Amino acid sequence: QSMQPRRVELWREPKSLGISIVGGRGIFIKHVLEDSPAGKNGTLKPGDRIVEVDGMDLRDASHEQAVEAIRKAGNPVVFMVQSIISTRL
């Protein structure tokens, strides 16, 4: 698998997007709600790194910065996500 971030579009429903995030001083997905736009997409999982939202860099974002940027996203919400991790041992 490419270790390039991948584009993920979430379509808002008139409630939440369905992700819990942690981190930020990376931004990571902690949980995905099954019955939500994130759950329905099917490709987002705990541990995924959110690197951009709607073209905006979140690599070095604070937690609060990320939260606002995602809350203030339009429709669809476009994420770039890093889903593959390699670890050197």
**What is the C-alpha to C-alpha distance for residues 32 and 39, in angstroms, rounded to an integer?**
6
Distance CA(39)–CA(45), nearest Å, equals: 9
Domain that holds residue 4: 1-89
* Total domains present in the chain: 1
| Experimental approach taken | X-ray
Given a contact cutoff of 8 angstroms between Cβ atoms, the answer to whether 29 and 46 are in contact is: yes
- ∠ at Cα 74 (71, 77), nearest 5°? 80
Other Cβ atoms within 10 Å of 80 Cβ, number: 20
* H or E segment to which residue 82 belongs: strand 77-82
CATH number at residue 41: 2.30.42.10
Please tell me what resolution, in angstroms, this structure has. 1.8
